[PDB]
Write a protein that binds this DNA or RNA. Structure first.
Ligand SMILES: Nc1ccn([C@H]2C[C@H](O)[C@@H](COP(=O)(O)NP(=O)(O)OP(=O)(O)O)O2)c(=O)n1
Ligand SMILES: [Mg+2]
Ligand SMILES: [Mg+2]
Length: 381
DNA sequence: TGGGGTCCT
DNA sequence: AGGACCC
């Protein structure tokens, strides 16, 4: 009933890919920029005071010698991401994707198959690969410790394979569930791995300063818990279950309370092929229908390129826009003939479709100014 | 004024 | 169609 789970997080992913593209940026402090924001930066820049998700002004101010690379086109990063996911799928068929650079792999069955091959005299030769959380002493007779050590061996093999086959470095965390693996992956960064033995579990769960640092607790839930006087992990462990159920609903309360103890009963789910494609474009303002129509033709073009390559045809189109000052969206199924024609000029009809979806949301007669325009193809089959 | 994704309601 | 979460 006890598992072995590994979590893989790539170091400065966008920056890493940009460095692989042209090695001219290997030692220069590098930051990947999308509009007025630096999503990530090279670790050389991270030394200079540059942080992830800084303003471009705050980045160049704290580090003027910073070199910036535009990263609004995610195509190369996406290619690398799925190469990583496939590589990990080689080890175990079930690999769950989180983000572009995070991956969960269930090593349990693989670890057992490994253990049955070893002999009684060899069970003493098992050694850890990478870091052990909190320098915890290993009990070679504790079977859980052994299985987690094998998990660290498989994790090291995974990272070595990633570097030799894709030229990518990453951090890994081996634990007994998903939450603890993802939490223990980032203990030693960059390009280091850490295994967490059960005794140290509580320590890790209290190393956190605030509760938002837990996956599954976002801005809304954390704001509500701040309003409820919950500011620490122990504050959530000790909170009355009934009151929390009443304030957050039944499901969320049970789940985040179980998370508050580091308990994760979730299994690794084979992510497989993506359930949707989408292209985004933001700006300061857009106040012309023809202005919006051209951007929709652009996003529509890139999406048309992407859908014909997957071989899976989308069955529903969605338009999302954000007005100036929240998001709003209107979708509809794609007609039968244009679905079949994908793979014939399919450009002209789709536009009209989206434009209809556009005119429903915004009255062209009344003035308007749009902040965000995004197109999505979903319901792939 | 980031550019994507997931599932639940 | 919107809302919560993740990177
Ligand atoms: N809000 C976000 C978060 C991440 N990303 C992209 C940029 C990152 O290169 C990539 C991975 O994000 P991340 O793992 O949170 N931090 P990154 O991998 O850049 O460096 P580490 O801090 O993991 O070493 O996703 C984004 O575009 N918008
Ligand atoms: Mg990450
Ligand atoms: Mg990362």
């Amino acid at each position: 009933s006890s598992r072995v789970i590994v979590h893989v997080d790539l170091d400065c992913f966008y920056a890493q890919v940009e460095m692989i593209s042209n090695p001219e940026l290997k030692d220069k402090p590098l930051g990947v920029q999308q509009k007025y924001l630096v999503v990530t930066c090279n670790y050389e820049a991270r030394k200079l005071g540059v942080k992830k998700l800084m303003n471009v002004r705050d980045a160049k101010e704290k580090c003027p010698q910073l070199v910036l690379v535009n990263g609004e086109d995610l195509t190369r990063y996406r290619e690398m991401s799925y190469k990583v996911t496939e590589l990990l799928e080689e080890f175990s068929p079930v690999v769950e994707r989180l983000g572009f650079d995070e991956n969960f792999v269930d090593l349990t069955e693989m670890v057992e198959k490994r253990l049955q091959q070893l002999q009684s005299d060899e069970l003493s030769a098992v050694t850890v690969s990478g870091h052990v959380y909190n320098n915890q002493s290993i009990n070679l007779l504790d079977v859980l410790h052994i299985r987690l050590l094998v998990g660290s061996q498989i994790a090291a093999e995974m990272r070595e394979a990633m570097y030799n086959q894709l030229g990518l470095t990453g951090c890994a965390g081996v634990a007994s569930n998903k939450l603890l693996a993802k939490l223990v992956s980032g203990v030693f960064k960059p390009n280091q791995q850490t295994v967490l033995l059960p005794e140290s579990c509580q320590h890790l769960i209290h190393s956190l300063n605030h509760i938002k640092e837990i996956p599954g607790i976002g801005y809304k839930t954390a704001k509500c818990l701040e309003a409820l006087g919950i500011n620490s992990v122990r504050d959530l462990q000790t909170f009355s279950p009934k009151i929390l159920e009443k304030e957050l609903g039944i499901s969320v309360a049970q789940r985040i309370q179980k998370l508050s103890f580091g308990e994760d009963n979730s299994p690794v789910i084979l992510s497989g092929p993506p359930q949707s494609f989408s292209e985004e474009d933001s700006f300061k303002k857009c106040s012309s229908e023809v202005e919006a129509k051209n951007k929709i033709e652009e996003l529509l073009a890139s999406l048309l390129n992407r859908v014909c390559q997957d071989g899976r045809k989308p069955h529903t189109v969605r338009l999302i826009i954000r007005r100036y000052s929240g998001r709003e969206s209107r979708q509809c199924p794609i007609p039968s003939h244009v679905i079949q024609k994908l793979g014939y000029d399919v450009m002209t009809p789709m536009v009209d479709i989206l434009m209809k979806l556009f005119r429903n949301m915004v009255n062209v007669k009344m003035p308007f100014h749009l902040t965000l325009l995004s197109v999505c193809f979903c319901n792939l089959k």
